[PDB]
Amino acid sequence: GHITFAASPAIALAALPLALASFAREFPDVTVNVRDGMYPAVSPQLRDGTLDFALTAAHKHDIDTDLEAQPLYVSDVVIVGQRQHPMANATRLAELQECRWAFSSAPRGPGAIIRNAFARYGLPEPKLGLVCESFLALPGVVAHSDLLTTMPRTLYERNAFKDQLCSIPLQDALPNPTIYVLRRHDLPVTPAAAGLIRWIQHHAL
Numbered sequence: 744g745h746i747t748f749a750a751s752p753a754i755a756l757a758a759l760p761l762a763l764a765s766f767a768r769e770f771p772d773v774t775v776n777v778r779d780g781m782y783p784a785v786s787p788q789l790r791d792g793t794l795d796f797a798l799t800a801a802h803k804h805d806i807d808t809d810l811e812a813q814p815l816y817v818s819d820v821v822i823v824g825q826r827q828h829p830m831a832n833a834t835r836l837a838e839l840q841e842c843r844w845a846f847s848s849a850p851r852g853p854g855a856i857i858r859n860a861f862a863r864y865g866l867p868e869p870k871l872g873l874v875c876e877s878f879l880a881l882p883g884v885v886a887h888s889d890l891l892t893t894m895p896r897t898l899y900e901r902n903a904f905k906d907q908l909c910s911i912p913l914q915d916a917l918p919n920p921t922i923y924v925l926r927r928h929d930l931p932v933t934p935a936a937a938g939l940i941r942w943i944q945h946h947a948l
């Protein structure tokens with residue numbers, strides 16, 4: 744009666760605590776073990792059965808045949824910079840094209856969201872200022888620099904540096920990844936795991 748799973752940062756910050764509280768009421772005899780995990784790194788842990796499932800951004804098409812991918816929702820990606828950033832008031836990606844970026848993690852590699860965003864608008868590649876794979880470190884790094892970055896809106900709202908950050912009110916499109924449940928399709932879904940996932944969906948809305 745154990746559930747071991749991984750959760751992505753957006754999930755970890757809002758949905759997870761509320762979900763675990765609702766779930767402990769409904770299934771009080773289940774022991775939960777939760778860890779950090781993003782796609783692709785969770786893939787072999789799901790594959791070998793160390794994780795029962797993982798809640799993470801991913802793209803349907805990159806995902807091994809072993810895994811099924813139940814979409815839960817679409818992420819809300821924001822561009823974030825220190826509060827007085829020269830580009831704080833920008834509305835178009837072309838206006839950011841000379842800024843330096845903290846490339847943050849994403850399923851297709853560090854900085855993949857903003858590189859793809861710039862590409863889709865026929866812009867040149869965004870300038871690399873630094874690679875920061877740690878969503879825990881990222882808000883404080885951006886707050887102490889003039890680097891821009893992308894992050895889920897939940898992390899922008901829930902970090903200890905939020906009074907020193909701003910979100911860029913972009914009117915151009917950003918390629919928001921979809922948040923999936925990832926699990927071996929050959930693994931039957933226990934009532935408890937299904938219950939916990941439904942709670943994370945319910946609270947993440």
Ligand SMILES: Cc1ccc(S(=O)(=O)O)cc1
Binds near residue numbers: 818848
């Ligand atoms: C770009 C991006 C990175 C990570 C996530 S998260 O997996 O929801 O925390 C969503 C969107």
Ligand SMILES: Cc1ccc(S(=O)(=O)O)cc1
Binds near residue numbers: 843873883884889890
């Ligand atoms: C925290 C931090 C990280 C990186 C830089 S920068 O490379 O000069 O933009 C400045 C400050």
Ligand SMILES: Cc1ccc(S(=O)(=O)O)cc1
Binds near residue numbers: 753819896898
């Ligand atoms: C509405 C909405 C959906 C998703 C997110 S996010 O998970 O923080 O990217 C924030 C807000």
